[PDB]
A paper describes a structure:
We first solved the high-resolution structure of Ig59 (residues 4428–4521). Human obscurin Ig59 was isolated based on the original sequence alignment (CAC44768.1). The resulting structure shows beta sheets extending from Glu 4436 to Lys 4439 (strand A), Ala 4441 to Arg 4444 (strand A’), Ala 4445 to Thr 4454 (strand B), Ser 4465 to Ile 4469 (strand C), Trp 4480 to Asp 4485 (stand D), His 4488 to Leu 4494 (strand E), Gly 4502 to Ala 4507 (stand F), and Ala 4513 to Leu 4520 (strand G). The best NMR structure, as defined as that with the lowest RMSD, and X-ray structure are highly similar to each other, with a pairwise RMSD of 1.609 Å. Based on the evidence that mutations in the M10 domain of TTN, which binds the Ig1 of obscurin, are found in patients with muscular dystrophy we sequenced the OBSCN exons encoding the titin-binding region at both M-band and Z-disk of patients with a clinical history of molecularly undiagnosed distal dystrophy. This analysis revealed the presence of a heterozygous missense variant c.13330C>T in exon 51 predicting an amino acid change from arginine to tryptophan (p.Arg4444Trp) in the Ig59 of obscurin (according to sequence NP_443075) in the proband of a French family. Circular dichroism (CD) experiments on the normal and mutant versions of the Ig59 domain are virtually identical, suggesting that the mutation does not globally disrupt the overall Ig-like architecture.
Titin is the largest protein in nature extending from the Z-disk to the M-band, and interacts with a number of sarcomeric and signalling proteins. One of these targets is another giant myofibril-associated protein, termed obscurin (OBSCN), that interacts with titin at both the M-band and the Z-disk. Obscurin and titin also interact at the Z-disk, through Ig58/Ig59 of obscurin and the titin ZIg9/ZIg10. The Ig59 domain is only a part of the titin binding region; both obscurin Ig58 and Ig59 domains and both titin ZIg9 and ZIg10 domains are necessary for this interaction at the Z-disk.
Author numbering: 3 to 92
Amino acid sequence: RLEILELLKNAAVRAGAQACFTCTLSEAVPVGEASWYINGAAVQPDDSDWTVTADGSHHALLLRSAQPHHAGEVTFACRDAVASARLTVL
């Protein structure tokens, strides 16, 4: 079974700063199989604010410059695994 070894963590960042959400899976799953969401909206590959990466077991969602409207619930979903945490923008 696919497991999440390391779950997302809540993050609080100042406006303009970088935020990142990461998780680690039990096996290497290509980035194409993962879906990230902010407040229920799927993150798109041409979103100028958010970057999605994967390296082996390690998946990440990066926000280079946080703004207040980015705040809310981050979801990661891959196969049957789901995780969530919260972005707070100070």
